[PDB]
Design a protein around this nucleic acid. Structure first.
Ligand SMILES: [Zn+2]
Ligand SMILES: [Zn+2]
Lengths: 126, 107, 307, 47, 67
RNA sequence: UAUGCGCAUAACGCCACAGAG
């Protein structure tokens, strides 16, 4: 048994930080090797929900079905959007953007880290 | 919107009725149980909370003769209110007695 | 035996022990555990206060992250009078002058340009590196600035450390205070703790003399046993048994566990109400009695509406 | 209007990155860049 | 990480007592005497400040802007 | 088959580690 009022104050509150490494070469293998994160400007699928680089804001929350990232094909013009498929509401923590080993890589590797709250509920183990 | 349910028994006697008091817990329930058990015309009285997920109490009152068990419930409510009014008067008079004795003994 | 109101009003009395700001010890004599526990439970969880509910962050570059900082800010007591406000309705995201308060916290840490002198303490190197509770600025909405004098709506304690910054980092947010009872969330609870204990009566079943009096004086809390030199020999007597904490250490002394009797005085309570600072604690006890009167009046109105 | 600022991991200088240009810091050439947090309203409950 | 605003067990405001506690301990008080001089009478309040490990000063050595 | 709005996208095994009861 845990006191409710201790739990409502800060007793054993937590978090879990999930880091999802998104690579447009490795997963999104459609061809032409020219995918970059970004939005087609004027897209009603990403309005005020992803930033102008097709990548969520850092304060932002993510419910189910929210736009998770957007990437556009540069040799075509078509922009795609990917949706957030996890069932837990998270808050974006940071987004780091990666090059290759030379500093010549293009804007296609990213690593979103999200915070899931996870305060103690009924059914948690102490 | 209705906070109070009166559940008579299968008999239509109205001498054994369970009172369901919504949005309520051990505070009013135990104080009412204390004040209704002071009635001589009450055979049985107890309360219980139905489940922790719910917020209501069941309160049983069984009377002896021809009075229904609504009259001890209403009398126990009025008697508990009169108790709390007298406790309020005594407490405020004592606090006012403390604040006058203290403010004059340092001056 | 029926409920005799006159016998209750003869035997009931309240004795105030100590009252300052934010603490109150008093006695209730001749009341039952049902009603005394009712008062204790009302003070814990049903006297309403004002507390932060929604936190609208704009920028938060600190390391105290956002959902943690919101809970952090909800646990701060807001020195408002909760009796002048109302419950915000179900589904009102925008609260009016009646039922909400607004506080703006907007602190930016910058490096101290001058007078650093290559030192090491943060109080000289940085400015606004600790975000305290005096940084919360009340934003009056509606006509609350005329209804409340200046410096009345504020937090109770300024110097509760909210967060801690470094140069470049910034906390920019806006808080909404609503009214609620501590049954809902513990942030609404107006008391540090409110509790009682029955008064102990220590009696001596046999006169205790000599070194046994000193053992008796040490087997209790400091103050209850006055050992005194009447003839030059020492005898023990109970003097202010309120100080005893029931450590029951006299029941380990094999010789002296037969000469005392520890019991409690039935229906003699010693309350202690420690306000957090939202209201004075005597006002909290008055409102806690009025809450139980309101419960009784609620169900009497239900009975009269059925009839 | 409102450029996308990224912060280098080492030198912490602010970097604007478009879609087609190679990502590396314009000063020190470092490979990891953190996205800048900008002012935008998010609502939390104090609970 | 950072000093809790309230005690966990009872709701006593303990968040405004961390710098006072450090200033009492640097003034050569015993930890029991420094907890007495803050009015922490129940041991629930008293372990909140006695056992607090303040990870935010270690966690701000990695402060990013360093400017 | 699932999601989103009849339409668009996504449609898996084998080892090895780690864990729960
Ligand atoms: Zn760099
Ligand atoms: Zn405590």
């Amino acid at each position: 048994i845990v006191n409710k009022a201790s739990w409502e104050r800060g007793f054993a509150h937590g978090s879990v930080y999930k880091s999802e490494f998104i690579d447009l070469s490795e997963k999104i293998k459609q061809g032409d090797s020219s995918l970059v994160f970004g939005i087609k400007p004027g897209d009603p699928r990403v309005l005020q929900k992803l930033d102008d680089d097709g990548l969520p804001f850092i304060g932002a929350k993510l419910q189910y079905g929210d736009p998770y990232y957007s990437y556009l094909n540069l040799n075509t013009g078509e922009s795609f959007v990917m949706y957030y498929k996890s069932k837990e509401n998270c808050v974006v923590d940071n987004i780091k953007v990666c090059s290759n080993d030379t500093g010549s890589g293009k804007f296609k590797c990213v690593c979103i880290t999200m915070r899931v709250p996870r305060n103690p509920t009924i059914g948690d183990k102490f | 919107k209705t906070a109070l349910e009166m559940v008579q028994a299968a008999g239509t006697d109205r001498h054994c009725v369970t009172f369901v008091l919504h949005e309520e817990d051990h505070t009013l329930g135990n104080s009412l149980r204390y004040m209704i058990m002071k009635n001589p015309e009450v055979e049985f009285c107890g309360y219980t909370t139905t489940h922790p997920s719910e917020s209501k109490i069941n309160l049983r009152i069984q009377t002896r003769g021809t009075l229904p068990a609504v009259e001890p419930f209403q009398r126990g409510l009025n008697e508990l209110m009169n108790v709390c009014q007298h406790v309020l008067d005594k407490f405020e008079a004592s606090i006012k007695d403390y604040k006058d004795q203290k403010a004059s003994r340092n001056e | 035996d029926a409920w005799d109101q006159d016998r209750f009003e003869k035997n009931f009395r309240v004795d105030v022990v100590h009252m300052d700001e934010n603490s109150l010890e008093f006695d209730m004599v001749g009341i039952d555990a049902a009603i005394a526990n009712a008062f204790r439970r009302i003070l814990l969880a049903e006297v309403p206060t004002m507390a932060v509910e929604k936190v609208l962050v704009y920028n938060n570059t600190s390391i105290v992250q956002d959902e943690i900082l919101a809970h952090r800010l909800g646990l701060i007591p807001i020195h408002a009078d909760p009796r002048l406000f109302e419950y915000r309705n179900q589904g009102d995201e925008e609260g009016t002058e009646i039922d909400t308060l607004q506080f703006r916290l907007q602190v930016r840490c910058t490096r101290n340009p001058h007078a650093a002198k290559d030192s090491s303490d943060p109080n000289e190197l940085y400015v606004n590196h600790k975000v305290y509770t005096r940084h919360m600025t009340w934003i009056p909405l509606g006509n609350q600035a005329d209804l409340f004098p200046e410096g009345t709506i504020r937090p109770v304690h300024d110097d509760i450390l909210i967060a801690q910054l470094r140069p470049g980092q910034e906390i920019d947010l806006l808080m909404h205070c609503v009214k609620g009872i501590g049954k809902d969330h513990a942030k609404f609870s107006p008391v540090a703790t409110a509790s009682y204990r029955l008064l102990p009566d220590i009696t001596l079943l046999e006169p205790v003399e000599g070194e046994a009096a000193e053992e008796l004086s040490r087997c209790f809390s400091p103050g209850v046993i006055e050992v005194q030199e009447v003839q030059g020999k020492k005898v023990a007597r109970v003097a202010n048994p309120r100080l005893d904490t029931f450590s029951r250490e006299i029941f380990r002394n094999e010789k002296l566990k037969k000469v005392v009797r520890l019991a409690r005085v039935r229906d003699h309570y010693i309350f202690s109400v420690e306000s957090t600072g939202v209201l004075p604690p005597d006002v909290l006890v008055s409102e806690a009695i009025k809450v139980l009167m309101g419960k009784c009046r609620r169900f009497l109105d239900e009975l009269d509406a059925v009839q | 209007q409102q450029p996308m600022i990224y912060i280098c991991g080492e030198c912490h200088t602010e970097n604007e990155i478009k879609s087609r240009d190679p990502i590396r810091c314009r000063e020190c050439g470092y490979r990891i860049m953190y996205k800048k947090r900008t002012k935008r309203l998010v609502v939390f409950d104090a609970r | 990480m950072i000093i809790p605003v309230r005690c966990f067990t009872c709701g006593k405001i303990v968040g405004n007592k961390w710098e006072a506690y450090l200033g009492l301990l640097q003034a050569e008080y015993t930890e029991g005497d420094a907890l007495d001089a803050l009015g922490l009478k129940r041991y629930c309040c008293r372990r909140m400040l006695l056992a607090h490990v303040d990870l935010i000063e270690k966690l701000l050595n990695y402060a990013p802007l360093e400017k």
